[PDB]
C-alpha cells in the first residue's frame, strides 16, 4: 500500500493560518489596535479544529505586518523606518488605554518589538489551558443557574493582544495592518465530530442557518 503520513493530525493542523488581522494608525491617541484572542472569527481554521471536540497543542504565532502611506498634504514625506510593538495582556492585567500608556512598558507582559523590512516575527507558546485539553465545544452555561451565557465563550478567556507604532511619525500619516497566524504544533485530538455543514454565522456560538444535506441532482439514476 501507500503511506498515510500526510493525513496525520500533526500534518493536518500544523500549517500557518491567518486567524485575525486588524489595523492601526500613527496619528490620534487611539492609534493602537486590540483583539480578544479567539479561534472562531476565521472559518477555515475553525472548521479544521472543530473536526474534533477536544484539542491540546502548542502554538506557533507568526505576524505579517504591512504598513502603507495614507494621504498627506505636506510638501515632502520621508518617513523613517517604522517599528511596531505587540503586547499580550493576560486576563486581569493592565490594558493600554492610549498609544502612550504605562502598560506598554511590558515589565511582565511578554511583547515583541519588530522593525519593518525584516523577517516576520515568530513566537511559540505552550499549552495555556486550565483543563487537561482545549475545548472546541461546550454544551453548558457560564452560571450555575443554567443561565447567563451558553457556549464556548464561557471558556474562552485567553487574554487580549494589543498593537502599536513605537515610532512617533509626524509628517506623513501611516496605517498598518497586522495579520496573526496560528500553527498548532505537537497536537493531540479526541472525540471526532461531523465536519461543519452550514456556513458559520457567529464567532461566539454554533448558531447556524439550516442548509441542505448535499448538492442536488435530478434522479437516482442521474449520472
Amino acid at each position: 500500500y501507500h503511506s498515510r503520513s500526510e493525513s496525520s493530525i500533526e500534518n493536518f493542523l500544523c500549517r500557518a493560518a491567518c486567524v485575525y488581522y486588524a489595523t492601526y494608525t500613527n496619528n490620534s491617541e487611539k492609534g493602537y489596535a486590540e483583539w480578544v484572542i479567539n479561534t472562531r472569527q476565521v472559518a477555515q481554521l475553525r472548521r479544521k479544529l472543530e473536526l474534533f471536540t477536544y484539542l491540546r497543542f502548542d502554538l506557533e504565532l507568526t505576524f505579517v505586518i504591512t504598513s502603507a502611506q495614507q494621504p498627506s498634504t505636506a510638501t515632502s514625506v520621508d518617513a523613517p523606518v517604522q517599528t511596531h510593538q505587540i503586547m499580550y495582556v493576560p486576563p486581569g492585567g493592565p490594558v493600554p488605554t492610549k498609544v502612550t500608556d504605562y502598560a506598554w512598558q511590558t515589565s511582565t507582559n511578554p511583547s515583541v518589538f519588530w522593525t519593518e523590512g525584516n523577517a516576520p516575527p515568530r513566537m511559540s507558546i505552550p499549552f495555556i489551558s486550565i483543563g487537561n485539553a482545549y475545548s472546541c465545544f461546550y454544551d453548558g452555561w457560564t452560571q450555575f443557574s443554567r443561565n447567563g451565557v451558553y457556549g464556548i465563550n464561557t471558556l474562552n478567556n485567553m487574554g487580549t493582544l494589543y498593537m502599536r507604532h513605537v515610532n512617533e511619525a509626524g509628517q506623513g500619516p501611516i496605517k498598518s495592518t497586522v495579520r496573526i497566524y496560528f500553527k498548532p504544533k505537537h497536537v493531540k485530538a479526541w472525540v471526532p465530530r461531523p465536519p461543519r455543514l452550514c456556513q458559520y454565522e457567529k464567532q461566539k456560538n454554533v448558531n447556524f442557518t439550516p442548509t441542505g444535506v448535499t448538492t442536488t441532482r435530478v434522479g437516482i439514476t442521474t449520472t
Binding site: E10, N11, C14, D58, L59, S124, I125, P126, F127, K185, H186, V187
Partner: peptide, 17 residues
C-alpha cells in the same frame, strides 16, 4: 540531524517524525 536550541518544549519542531 536536528537538535533543539530552546529550553522549552513548546519551541520544538512539529511531530513529523
Amino acid at each position: 540531524t536536528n537538535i533543539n536550541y530552546y529550553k522549552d518544549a513548546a519551541s520544538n519542531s512539529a511531530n513529523r517524525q
